[PDB]
Design a protein around this ligand. Structure first.
Ligand code: ZN
Ligand code: ZN
Length: 219
């Protein structure tokens, strides 16, 4: 395993594969926020941005230099700041921001700019030699939240829908659907067996075990 951050301390990235990396930034309240960096033959793909354009730009610049290839696409799992805060930057630089039609709407509501809203309940994307599946399991952390699946490495990106082993709380639930939340988690476990690793938007990376944990918190 390897960890490497920029010369400001703001942003840090960590490797999972010859192709998969995890970015993490802070938003003092300090609250770490994480997403993915997909290193593909035909460009770089971000799974979820960061708290604000400030950090987003700083991130792109960092990885685009490190990997010597452009960030072509990004995927937005839901319309909250920790996920979509850099949407203005993505659209400035001509990056494709994918999302569900719903996530797109809720972005307008929250004073952000709108992603594409081109994803379905199940969407299969391919960026070079990289296969990426987006899945909408139902309401939970928010009503629009989705998960991302990487078939080649059996890696699941939980987002804010999945709590880390270190998370004792449910966090903010102002926009959460606490009953459907359990069902949605079922829908994911049903769809993806043999899960290699699971990535929570906040906290350390884990396995199929974080799903059971989140369910514990919903009891
Ligand atoms: Zn959220
Ligand atoms: Zn969150």
């Amino acid at each position: 395993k390897t960890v490497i951050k920029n010369e400001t301390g703001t942003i840090s990235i960590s490797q999972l594969n010859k192709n998969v990396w995890v970015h993490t930034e802070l938003g003092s309240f300090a609250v770490p926020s994480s997403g993915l960096v997909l290193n593909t033959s035909k460009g770089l793909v971000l799974v979820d941005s960061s708290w604000d354009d400030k950090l987003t730009k700083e991130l792109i610049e960092m990885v685009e230099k490190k990997f010597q290839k452009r960030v072509t696409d990004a995927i937005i799992t839901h319309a909250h700041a920790d996920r979509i805060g850099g949407i203005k930057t993505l659209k400035e630089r001509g990056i494709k921001a994918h999302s569900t039609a719903l996530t797109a709407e809720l972005a307008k509501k929250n004073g952000y700019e709108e992603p594409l809203g081109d994803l379905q309940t199940v969407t299969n994307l391919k960026f070079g030699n990289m296969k990426v599946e987006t899945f909408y399991p139902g309401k939970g952390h928010t009503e629009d939240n989705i998960v991302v699946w990487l078939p080649q490495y059996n890696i699941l990106v939980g987002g804010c829908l999945v709590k880390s082993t270190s998370a004792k709380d449910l966090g903010n639930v102002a926009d959460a659907y606490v009953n459907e939340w359990s069902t949605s988690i079922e829908n994911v476990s049903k769809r993806y067996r043999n899960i290699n690793a699971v990535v929570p938007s906040h906290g350390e990376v884990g396995d199929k075990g974080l799903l059971l944990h989140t369910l514990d918190l919903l009891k």
